[PDB]
Design a protein around this ligand. Sequence first.
Ligand code: SF4
Ligand code: SF4
Ligand SMILES: [Ca+2]
Ligand SMILES: [Ca+2]
Ligand SMILES: [Ca+2]
Ligand SMILES: [Ca+2]
Ligand SMILES: [Ca+2]
Ligand SMILES: [Cl-]
Ligand SMILES: [Cl-]
Ligand SMILES: [Cl-]
Ligand SMILES: [Cl-]
Ligand SMILES: [Cl-]
Ligand SMILES: [Cl-]
Ligand SMILES: [Cl-]
Ligand code: NI
Ligand code: NI
Lengths: 629, 694
Amino acid sequence: EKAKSIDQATLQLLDKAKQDGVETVWDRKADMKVQCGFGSAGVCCRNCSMGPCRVSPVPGKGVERGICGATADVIVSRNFARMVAAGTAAHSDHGRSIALSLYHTSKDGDIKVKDENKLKEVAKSFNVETEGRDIYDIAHDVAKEGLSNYGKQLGEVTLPPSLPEKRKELWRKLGVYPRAVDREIAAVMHSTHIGCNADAEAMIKMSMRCSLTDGWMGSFMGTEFSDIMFGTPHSIDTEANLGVLEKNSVNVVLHGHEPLLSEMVVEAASDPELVELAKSVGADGINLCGMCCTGNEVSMRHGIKIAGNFMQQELAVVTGAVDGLIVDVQCIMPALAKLSKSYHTKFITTSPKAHITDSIYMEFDEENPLDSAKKILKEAILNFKNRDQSKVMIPELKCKAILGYSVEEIINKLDKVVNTQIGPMQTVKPLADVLVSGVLRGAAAVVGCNNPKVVQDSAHIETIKGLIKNDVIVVVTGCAAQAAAKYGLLQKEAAEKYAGPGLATVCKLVDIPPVLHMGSCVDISRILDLVGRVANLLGVDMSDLPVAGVAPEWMSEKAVAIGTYVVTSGIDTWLGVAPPVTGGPEVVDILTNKMEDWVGAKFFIETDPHKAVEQIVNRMNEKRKKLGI
Amino acid sequence: MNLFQTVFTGSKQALAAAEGIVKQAVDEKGRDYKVAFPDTAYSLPVIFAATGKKITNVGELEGALDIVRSLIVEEEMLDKLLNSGLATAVAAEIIEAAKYVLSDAPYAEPCVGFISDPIIRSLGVPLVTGDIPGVAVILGECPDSETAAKIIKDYQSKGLLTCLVGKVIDQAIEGKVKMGLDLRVIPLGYDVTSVIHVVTIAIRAALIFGGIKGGQLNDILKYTAERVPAFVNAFGPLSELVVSAGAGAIALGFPVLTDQVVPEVPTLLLTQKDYDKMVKTSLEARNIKIKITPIPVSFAAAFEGENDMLAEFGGNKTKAWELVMCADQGEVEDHKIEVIGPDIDTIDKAMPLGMLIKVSGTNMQKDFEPVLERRLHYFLNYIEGVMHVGQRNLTWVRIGKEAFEKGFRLKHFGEVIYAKMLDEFGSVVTIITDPGKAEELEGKYAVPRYKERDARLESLVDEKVDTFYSCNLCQSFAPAHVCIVTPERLGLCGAVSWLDAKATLELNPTGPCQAVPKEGVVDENLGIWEKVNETVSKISQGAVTSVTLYSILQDPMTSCGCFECITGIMPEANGVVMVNREFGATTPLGMTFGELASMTGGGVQTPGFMGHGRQFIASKKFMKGEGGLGRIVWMPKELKDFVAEKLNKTAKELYNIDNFADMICDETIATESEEVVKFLEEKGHPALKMDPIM
Ligand code: SF4
Ligand code: SF4
Ligand SMILES: [Ca+2]
Ligand SMILES: [Ca+2]
Ligand SMILES: [Ca+2]
Ligand SMILES: [Ca+2]
Ligand SMILES: [Ca+2]
Ligand SMILES: [Cl-]
Ligand SMILES: [Cl-]
Ligand SMILES: [Cl-]
Ligand SMILES: [Cl-]
Ligand SMILES: [Cl-]
Ligand SMILES: [Cl-]
Ligand SMILES: [Cl-]
Ligand code: NI
Ligand code: NI
């Protein structure tokens, strides 16, 4: 049997899960046996009741077309586009909720404007005045202009400045320039409907246009507005892995993606009444932990310890020390409702967007957010009284990590390597300098979730370690960033242990780890911003720089939308899990070949992380030669 | 070509040049001819450092060419580039060693060529002691002799050892530069390879002073990078060979700064086109800090202590003010030395002085500024004939006639401030003599900055601190003064607040403001903590052992000399009196402010008398051990009116007195003790019904 994970804490609790007689994502993966091959190759269509239909992924043999006459390439391309539309929708609702919060800020209100400087700069992008006006009047105007990008039917959408004009004109020439966020989702869902688009090239171009409304808009707006209200991240210390849970404290684990609830549970944990309540139940205090993106958002701004990533969520409950597991939306395995019944843990659902049967439902009132968070957190604190300390088992394994590397913080840190009499301040010139000089052979972004098809964290760690050894600075987000935090790569000490000659030298000068944690996946917009800033400073397009993106163990439809907008933005993307495209020869050719001729970048599917690292380094050298660097 | 290919190319050219010269030595002197450098105990230093072997004959010198070949590995990775640079250094040594074989004395004045070991010994000690702050390796050609001489004379002015190679030697001569070992300007040679003659100085410093042995290349490269303060200044067009040589300098940890457009590498390879800034750029690039830092009159700590004045500004005569604000926009952020108002020259017989400073450099916090307002007092005091006292809005400066005779101008004020700000606040980084601008600006930015500043400790109480801060900056004049600082007891100078002292420790960890943990509580009314006494004993050197924070009679806190107000005991009125520096008349104690000051300061424990700022008056911990502010009996009208509502409220919180100020006597009512006690009896001061003060 293949190993389930590389992390020792994860393997320890997996044994406990077996002894306790509970099901895990690995058990359910095994139960699925040989998964379907039509669904795997993407040649199964259920877009109308004339179906279901299943064509042959092998051209020449089997059924050639669907009942409507749709060829395999059409079926595959429509299935792929719907994944992008769904992924874009997930990020769209996230950012939309943030923009609505920005519209309800107040001087003496629960949600305030913490970073005024950032809001002023963001107002310039939306053409909102910032002279002699109340900061909340500017915030509401910026929120209204941001909300327009979700559903404006007339006029043009507002894109961030970091985006090069060369890239914008290229999208225009190709016909993939972005329209309103929700409008594009409708366009994909419409053309994928029966009797509409039946051309692989056109469908894949429509999905790319939709994906752009995710990266340069919803995810970008979501990140920008979050930094305004909750603060822009700066270098901060934290601890990662399930060892962060404390046996004599109230363990409240925040899982999900929305940041406002997590931000309020943090503020609620400081309420004297709730601090005393934790003592009344007999606890050391309130131990706040996070998981997945929501845990990243709170750890980036408040250093809140990270309990774990996607496939570790069930094992956090298995410790028997989680008193309350508060969730919102995105990647909250429904299995947690049944699993929590075997332990004292109170699985609380708070979003009307994500109701889970058999879970305690405490709606998070967005009108009285702090009072709402206090009421939810109180239930988790009171549940400490129902703990069975005899069945508790927290692996004695945690790891130190540094995060909070926003573009502003990366720039602030780079200013320490700039002479007061030559280079300008607050610019990305030092990073472009090392990239052009050749000390840093390139810059890779390792992002992604976790999939049972791959050994948990194995591809993430093997890819990151391999890229940093070959002098390629690595930036991480989401579960990939958490995977690196647990292993110990998000440390200053990791540069001498795992980085190459050039990268270890740069780490010593800039005083940074060899791997930079830039946040959640909505924070992948920071990667686009950073790369875009380097492109503009060097007067070139994003496709001209020696950069690359990697998704070693993805699974979410969000990951497909991310990958698509990363490639459409001009950055080559590598996938560690093969998407359902095998059955469409034209679709495979488009994604892994013709795309290079449309956006200057393409997809690369590679399950072996060692081969992927070689391919990335070679591709970067190829782009360096074309640029003469 | 990219930086890598350029370096490889130049290294191959260096090897090709070393193969050609070595062939001449084998064909002309044979493979057994002795190869050696003049008076050196390390044969070929570079080869000796890398291999630990000594080259004695032409045959062995031929074999050393394989070391050059082994160091050139055309693979684009940093280590490979640096080794390629070391290959160029080894090739240059071979070329120069061969020069001494084909000619007994290949060099002649001005050029020196090889530097003998006795010179390394002679220069090595001052290098270690820091008397030679840096080694400027100037290489190439300048646009004109005027810019070459300008730079060389500037480096030599800071005591740096300048070494010249190339056409820059001829330019230094043409520009009338004094060259010699005693003059710290050594011309090594016209060829690029002669740069190796300064590289051997750094390598031999590692072998002689560093005590490292041959073959320990990594240890030698670490010694040069961390202990030899050298840097390269390459001017004019750079060939691939020169770039390759620059990689060798970078391999020894020496930054290369050039005036040409090259692929810049932060902190290692830089491009500065402004020749008038190349010196400051290079000194910063190699962390060389010069002790000497634009004003005809002398500037030093000797003029800190302190004839009539040409112009006086501030105090109780004109409205002057000082303000340091950190802001990235709103105005031109630069070394703009600007004076907006009637200049001092206009004055014919014995004006305001607005001082708004703006700094927006990286890593500058909005609560870090106060630490700047304080340092202005020190910078302005060091100016010969100028004195600065008072804190922010209430500031007093008196310019001296000598300075006017020296022709000093307000322009030099802006220069001294900016120049000292970059020197001291380097890691974290406008005069108005016109009434109108002084007015608006006073309240447009300063008052706000202040109000927000005071607002911090406005409601804060010592009830929640875990550590106090001890300052010893006043120890220059008062050798036993250790100023403890609390959110309620402020620095006697009136500027440093418990928070500014916190910021001072963040900026200068080894500065005057140091942490003192609040442990061993003995008394809360008198303020006696076992650690607080202990830390004072260490700084005072055994002079001050026991101390109280809220008591003027029992073991009081020592006073320095920057106190704006003084508080003296008046037993006949069962209270105390107060006097401000502005008051020039006698007090009930029969003493003037200057006479009182000579009884409080000097870093001595003086029971009954103490020095404090204008804020402590209203503080609850003011003489609380003696009854608090209730003891204040006499006070000048000027100070009374200023601190009137702040005392009337704090007094109500304690004795419920609603018009304490009205109960206080002043020079208007009477000064004589007998008349003051009569006024106190008529009104009914609490001090009369309080317990005996002594
Ligand atoms: S879209 Fe075509 S292949 Fe799919 S279910 Fe409908 S008729 Fe069948
Ligand atoms: S009076 Fe006190 S706080 Fe002020 S400079 Fe002197 S020792 Fe420091
Ligand atoms: Ca922006
Ligand atoms: Ca001798
Ligand atoms: Ca090799
Ligand atoms: Ca001339
Ligand atoms: Ca020239
Ligand atoms: Cl198992
Ligand atoms: Cl179960
Ligand atoms: Cl339990
Ligand atoms: Cl920039
Ligand atoms: Cl491993
Ligand atoms: Cl000397
Ligand atoms: Cl250096
Ligand atoms: Ni003093
Ligand atoms: Ni003093």
